[PDB]
Design a protein around this ligand. Structure first.
Ligand SMILES: CC(=O)Oc1c(C)cccc1C(=O)O
Ligand SMILES: [Ca+2]
Ligand SMILES: [Ca+2]
Ligand SMILES: [Ca+2]
Ligand SMILES: [Ca+2]
Ligand SMILES: [Zn+2]
Length: 316
């Protein structure tokens, strides 16, 4: 919409107060003009037609329960924008400040979030398995990273390239969570998953097997469920990324950690310069090694650690 940039205030899913960038034109819209070509948040109104209506509010105050998923979708999309621009010099998901669009209140009791090829989409959860999914900054950043992947490597969403696609989203969603630095961890979705159970999550990068996901290539799933296990075999790569960053000994193989920022530089470079739509795990290994070589030198600890990490999860 055409209008003037304003600043609204509201509360997110977890009941936390935050400021949000809005636009005024009769109503206050969830349209942030301060980042790129705009961040826009929409109301899907419990149906599945998308994007729905640009979110409109009469007084620029967003404290109703119905407002909370919108507040967080909008805010955490801005945080994610900031991360890619400030940390990787990437302007929005296409590198050219594409408008970022999100719809919330998608469907009824919908326990998922996704990128549909053009925008982010968030269910409200059924209140049992999930609360509104935009309350999780790692979930929001996971979803926006799917757009980044689609504009760069283009990893096909099936089998090993699809598991890499998923891990890339878990990795950067986690790196965005640490960037924001509010209760950061190597778990995925803990802020919005199972409101009646404490201490669990959708997935764990530090120990994927905690929820039945493989942490070694020898334990890879090869059936046809979940697009050939894209949310399952992602644990093999998530574990590798965790180890690159934090170090550890896994099935007897020791990895010297090099920290989250270097993890992020290496995987961002792999994603944007070396991976292709059909890359498999072995090719991801070579891409990360080449990326680390580009960044830190053939003889660096960093190259050595990437190798140890892929060794540890049985990927040669
Ligand atoms: C964070 C995440 O994995 O979100 C999803 C959920 C909650 C359900 C189904 C698919 C996805 C996805 O983004 O792959
Ligand atoms: Ca209001
Ligand atoms: Ca957390
Ligand atoms: Ca997390
Ligand atoms: Ca829980
Ligand atoms: Zn995903």
């Amino acid at each position: 919409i055409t209008g003037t940039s304003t600043v609204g205030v509201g509360r997110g899913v977890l009941g936390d107060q935050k400021n949000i960038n809005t636009t005024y034109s009769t109503y206050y819209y969830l349209q942030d003009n301060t980042r790129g070509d705009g961040i826009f948040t929409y109301d899907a109104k419990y149906r599945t037609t998308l994007p729905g209506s640009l979110w409109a509010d009469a007084d620029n105050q967003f404290f109703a329960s119905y407002d909370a998923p919108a507040v967080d979708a909008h805010y955490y999309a801005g945080v994610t924008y900031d991360y890619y621009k400030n940390v990787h010099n990437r302007l929005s998901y296409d590198g050219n400040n594409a408008a970022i669009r999100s719809s919330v209140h998608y469907s009824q009791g919908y326990n998922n979030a996704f990128w549909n090829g053009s925008e982010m989409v968030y269910g409200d959860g059924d209140g049992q398995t999930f609360i509104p999914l935009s309350g999780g900054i790692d979930v929001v950043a996971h979803e926006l990273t799917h757009a980044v992947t689609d504009y760069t490597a283009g990893l096909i969403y099936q089998n090993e390239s699809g598991a890499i696609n998923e891990a890339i989203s878990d990795i950067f969603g986690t790196l965005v969570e640490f960037y924001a630095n509010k209760n950061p961890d190597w778990e995925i979705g803990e802020d919005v998953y199972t409101p009646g159970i404490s201490g669990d999550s959708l997935r764990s990068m530090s120990d994927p097997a905690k929820y039945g996901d493989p942490d070694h290539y020898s334990k890879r799933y090869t059936g046809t469920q979940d697009n050939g296990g894209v949310h399952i075999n992602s644990g093999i790569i998530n574990k590798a990324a965790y180890l690159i960053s934090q170090g550890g000994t896994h099935y007897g193989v020791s990895v010297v950690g090099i920290g989250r920022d270097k993890l992020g530089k290496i995987f961002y470079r792999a994603l944007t310069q070396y991976l292709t739509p059909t890359s498999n795990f072995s090719q991801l290994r070579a891409a990360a090694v080449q990326s680390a070589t580009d960044l830190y030198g053939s003889t660096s600890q960093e190259v050595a650690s990437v190798k140890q990490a892929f060794d540890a999860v049985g990927v040669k």
